[PDB]
Amino acid sequence: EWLQAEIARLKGKSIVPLQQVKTLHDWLDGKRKARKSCRVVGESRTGKTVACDAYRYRHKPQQEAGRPPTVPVVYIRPHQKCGPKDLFKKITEYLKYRVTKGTVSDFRDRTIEVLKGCGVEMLIIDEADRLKPETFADVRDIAEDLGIAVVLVGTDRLDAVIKRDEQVLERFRAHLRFGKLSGEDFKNTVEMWEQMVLKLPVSSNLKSKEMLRILTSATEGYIGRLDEILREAAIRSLSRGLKKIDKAVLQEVAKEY
Amino acid sequence: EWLQAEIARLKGKSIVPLQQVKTLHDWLDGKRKARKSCRVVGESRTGKTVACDAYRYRHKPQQEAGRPPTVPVVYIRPHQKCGPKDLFKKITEYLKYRVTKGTVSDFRDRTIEVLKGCGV
Amino acid sequence: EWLQAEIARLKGKSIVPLQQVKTLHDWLDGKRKARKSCRVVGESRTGKTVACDAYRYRHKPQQEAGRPPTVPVVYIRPHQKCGPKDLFKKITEYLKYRVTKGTVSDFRDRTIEVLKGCGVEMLIIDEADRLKPETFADVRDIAEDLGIAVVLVGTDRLDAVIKRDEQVLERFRAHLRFGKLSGEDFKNTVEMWEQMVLKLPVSSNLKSKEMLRILTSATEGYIGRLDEILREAAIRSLSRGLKKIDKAVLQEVAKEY
Amino acid sequence: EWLQAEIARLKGKSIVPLQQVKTLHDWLDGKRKARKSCRVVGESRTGKTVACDAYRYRHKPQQEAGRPPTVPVVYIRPHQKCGPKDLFKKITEYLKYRVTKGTVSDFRDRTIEVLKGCGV
DNA sequence: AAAAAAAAAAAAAAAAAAAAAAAAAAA
DNA sequence: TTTTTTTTTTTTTTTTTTTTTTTTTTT
Numbered sequence: 001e002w003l004q005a006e007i008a009r010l011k012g013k014s015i016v017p018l019q020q021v022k023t024l025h026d027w028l029d030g031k032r033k034a035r036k037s038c039r040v041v042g043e044s045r046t047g048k049t050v051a052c053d054a055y056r057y058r059h060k061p062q063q064e065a066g067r068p069p070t071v072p073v074v075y076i077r078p079h080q081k082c083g084p085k086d087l088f089k090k091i092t093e094y095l096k097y098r099v100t101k102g103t104v105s106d107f108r109d110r111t112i113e114v115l116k117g118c119g120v121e122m123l124i125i126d127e128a129d130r131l132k133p134e135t136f137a138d139v140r141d142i143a144e145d146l147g148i149a150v151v152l153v154g155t156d157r158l159d160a161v162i163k164r165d166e167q168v169l170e171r172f173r174a175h176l177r178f179g180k181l182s183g184e185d186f187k188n189t190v191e192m193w194e195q196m197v198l199k200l201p202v203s204s205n206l207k208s209k210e211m212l213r214i215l216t217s218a219t220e221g222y223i224g225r226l227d228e229i230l231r232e233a234a235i236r237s238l239s240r241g242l243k244k245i246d247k248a249v250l251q252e253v254a255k256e257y
Numbered sequence: 258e259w260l261q262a263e264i265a266r267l268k269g270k271s272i273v274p275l276q277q278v279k280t281l282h283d284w285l286d287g288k289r290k291a292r293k294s295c296r297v298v299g300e301s302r303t304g305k306t307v308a309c310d311a312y313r314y315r316h317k318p319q320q321e322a323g324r325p326p327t328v329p330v331v332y333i334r335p336h337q338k339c340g341p342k343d344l345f346k347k348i349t350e351y352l353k354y355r356v357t358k359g360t361v362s363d364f365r366d367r368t369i370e371v372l373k374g375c376g377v
Numbered sequence: 378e379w380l381q382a383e384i385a386r387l388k389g390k391s392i393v394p395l396q397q398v399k400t401l402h403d404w405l406d407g408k409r410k411a412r413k414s415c416r417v418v419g420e421s422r423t424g425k426t427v428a429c430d431a432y433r434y435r436h437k438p439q440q441e442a443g444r445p446p447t448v449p450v451v452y453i454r455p456h457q458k459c460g461p462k463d464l465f466k467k468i469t470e471y472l473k474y475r476v477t478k479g480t481v482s483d484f485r486d487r488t489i490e491v492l493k494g495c496g497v498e499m500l501i502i503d504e505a506d507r508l509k510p511e512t513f514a515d516v517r518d519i520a521e522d523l524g525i526a527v528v529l530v531g532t533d534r535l536d537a538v539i540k541r542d543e544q545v546l547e548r549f550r551a552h553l554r555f556g557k558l559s560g561e562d563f564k565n566t567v568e569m570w571e572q573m574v575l576k577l578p579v580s581s582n583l584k585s586k587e588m589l590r591i592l593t594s595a596t597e598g599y600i601g602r603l604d605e606i607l608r609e610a611a612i613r614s615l616s617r618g619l620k621k622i623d624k625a626v627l628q629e630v631a632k633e634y
Numbered sequence: 635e636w637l638q639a640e641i642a643r644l645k646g647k648s649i650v651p652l653q654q655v656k657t658l659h660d661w662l663d664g665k666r667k668a669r670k671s672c673r674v675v676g677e678s679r680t681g682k683t684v685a686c687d688a689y690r691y692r693h694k695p696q697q698e699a700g701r702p703p704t705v706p707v708v709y710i711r712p713h714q715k716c717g718p719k720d721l722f723k724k725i726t727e728y729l730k731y732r733v734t735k736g737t738v739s740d741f742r743d744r745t746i747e748v749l750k751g752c753g754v
Numbered sequence: 755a756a757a758a759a760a761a762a763a764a765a766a767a768a769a770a771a772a773a774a775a776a777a778a779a780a781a
Numbered sequence: 782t783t784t785t786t787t788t789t790t791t792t793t794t795t796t797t798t799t800t801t802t803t804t805t806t807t808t
């Protein structure tokens with residue numbers, strides 16, 4: 001059944017090239033070369049997490065020689081209230097090295113060893129908002145000691161916790177800001193989304209004035225919300241038998257979500 | 258005594274389906290297939306337990322092989338002042354798995370493992 | 378230098394189909410489908426572990442669905458003086474499952490739990506002798522508790538340790554034996570080697586009376602010796618600029634060993 | 635590339651002499667001769683770390699004699715929240731001596747021993 | 755503010771092998 | 782005497798639980 005292919009494609013998420021993503025990538029390469037830690041702060045549903053993964057996928061571990069592979073970029077996600085011991089364990093596991101059992105100081109020695117062995121040009125701490133307040137001291141330790149550029153990708157609370165420790169604020173003074181979509185940028189993103197993401201047989205002219213206004217008001221510049229609503233209404237049209245999303249279909253979803 | 262048999266029936270547990278239950282069931286199957294989290298807000302003693310039980314009755318896990326059962330839905334009730342450890346423990350017990358000993362990080366890993374095995 | 382690449386290809390490891398290998402794969406698949414335990418006893422340098430690796434390669438752990446992957450074959454190689462914990466831990470790590478902290482009693486149940494999610498009809502234990510008799514009870518607990526075709530790959534010491542327990546003997550009574558290569562069978566294997574593995578552009582005629590004399594004395598019917606000796610002789614002849622192995626070179630390899 | 639060599643030289647770290655460093659060195663030498671304990675207080679990113687390290691490189695551990703190397707100056711950087719064990723361990727390792735398994739009392743005795751043997 | 759949940763550090767208890775050396779014994 | 786043969790005798794690596802103390806969090 002052909003319809004199952006459309007359903008399956010729409011169920012899964014994807015990556016859609018955007019100006020914001022390329023901006024972040026061009027910014028990140030400079031600090032990787034410069035070996036200087038940075039900060040990234042923006043709202044949720046802006047796609048910053050997607051751009052982080054997209055940056056990491058381009059740079060992979062190279063193992064031509066028989067020796068350990070060089071992982072230039074490490075991306076990790078600490079859990080809620082993640083402590084120093086747990087944070088070190090995550091880094092060790094990311095590098096395919098056995099995690100020895102012991103106290104926090106032992107884990108620290110193990111982590112420094114495995115980080116020195118590989119290249120590690122950049123270390124990324126994803127959603128540092130849930131990172132424990134005590135950990136920002138050990139993160140700074142690694143930053144100064146190993147010459148590894150460290151990037152913190154978090155929300156607004158990050159600014160709150162960073163300011164309390166004068167040294168941690170000194171370590172990551174500079175930052176890049178993520179924002180929301182608006183105006184012509186939002187409209188262009190919506191039309192480009194219809195051309196790239198949506199596989200519906202007939203274009204609904206979502207860039208038209210009668211429907212693009214609904215998308216503008218409902219998504220409120222959140223690329224995540226835009227993704228959700230577009231994919232959902234697009235899937236819904238097909239069971240009824242529609243080649244394109246209708247204005248009423250667009251209105252029905254936003255009220256529920 | 259026949260009278261006492263009727264009394265035992267009257268003092269027992271039973272279900273009378275309501276329009277609230279059917280409406281919620283349709284919406285819940287929608288949210289389940291859509292895989293979207295949501296809330297349900299309303300007054301107590303309005304059949305919340307009945308809705309939960311009648312929904313759970315429709316989807317019954319089947320375990321024809323030694324692999325983990327094909328469980329579509331998980332059902333838990335957090336205790337008063339429930340912490341993270343308790344959420345993890347209740348999810349683990351519901352799916353018929355041994356509760357690990359240790360801290361919240363260990364419980365978290367254990368819970369994700371058991372959740373990943375089944376459909377959930 | 379092209380000669381360097383031509384030389385380097387020979388130092389490589391390769392598998393050559395043989396009569397004994399073909400027998401082993403069918404026999405083990407029969408025991409696997411039957412879910413019944415059996416034993417393996419052969420003299421050293423007979424490639425039975427190579428055949429076990431090949432049998433493991435034939436069956437590929439499929440991941441059709443999100444539910445735990447269906448690994449049908451388990452292959453663990455114990456060390457020296459292995460206890461219950463190391464055995465259980467190797468089973469756990471082989472299936473790519475986290476080794477948690479805790480007691481040995483909990484450790485024993487971790488492996489039992491991970492085994493059910495995957496098929497794991499046949500567990501194959503290479504170097505079964507190097508194990509503790511107090512671990513044979515755990516190994517046989519697998520055979521009694523679950524329908525698992527536990528296979529014990531071992532030498533003569535395996536027989537010696539197994540007979541000391543009637544229960545283990547009854548559970549692992551079925552077995553397979555190996556022989557050696559002699560006479561025309563050895564010459565056939567030698568020519569098969571020369572045509573399948575020898576990377577020299579010109580035939581060395583290793584089935585000649587003189588070369589067969591040297592090889593019969595040097596290998597004594599052991600396939601590992603044949604492999605090693607022929608690779609080394611080919612390299613020694615390449616160092617003199619030849620397209621094939623001279624007779625004196627083969628004799629020199631025999632003298633060194 | 636010549637330009638890349640100059641750029642790499644700029645990217646590297648070098649040590650420059652300042653009056654603040656000379657003042658610190660004189661102060662520390664006076665204290666060393668008097669064997670009087672003291673402290674150094676200042677703001678971050680002021681470079682006092684480098685000045686102390688520079689004092690260390692002034693005089694190294696002479697080992698010309700047949701007896702163990704004599705270390706006049708020990709310099710350590712304790713990690714975050716280091717207790718009364720890791721400190722002793724770091725001292726011992728800085729003196730190129732083995733670490734023995736034991737308790738805090740054992741580490742304490744071992745540390746006093748290695749501190750008495752060398753000048754320190 | 756003042757009770758309730760969380761990482762280091764000491765301290766106690768128990769088999770299971772293995773080797774070596776000596777002493778006695780038997781034709 | 783040569784060898785056997787045992788028989789003691791003596792000397793050696795892994796596993797587990799239980800307090801205390803202390804520092805952060807919340808309420």
Ligand SMILES: Nc1ncnc2c1ncn2[C@@H]1O[C@H](COP(=O)(O)OP(=O)(O)O)[C@@H](O)[C@H]1O
Nearest residue numbers: 014015016043044045046047048049050224227
């Ligand atoms: N370029 C993109 N392509 C597809 N989906 C995207 C893109 N950017 C963002 N998203 C959507 O946004 C969500 C992730 O954003 P999020 O993790 O909240 O980033 P941040 O933490 O920076 O807000 C995903 O659900 C994803 O579908």
Ligand SMILES: Nc1ncnc2c1ncn2[C@@H]1O[C@H](COP(=O)(O)OP(=O)(O)O)[C@@H](O)[C@H]1O
Nearest residue numbers: 391392393421422423424425426427600601604
């Ligand atoms: N059929 C075969 N295919 C490939 N190599 C083989 C084969 N038979 C024997 N060998 C050789 O045996 C050597 C390793 O043998 P090994 O794995 O130790 O088996 P086993 O332990 O049974 O002796 C390898 O160097 C290999 O070249």
Ligand SMILES: Nc1ncnc2c1ncn2[C@@H]1O[C@H](COP(=O)(O)OP(=O)(O)O)[C@@H](O)[C@H]1O
Nearest residue numbers: 648649650651652677678679680681682683684
């Ligand atoms: N004497 C010095 N010469 C050159 N650079 C210095 C000096 N002192 C400090 N710095 C700069 O400061 C950094 C090291 O000083 P730092 O350890 O931060 O001092 P503190 O720890 O007291 O803040 C180096 O990156 C270096 O660039």
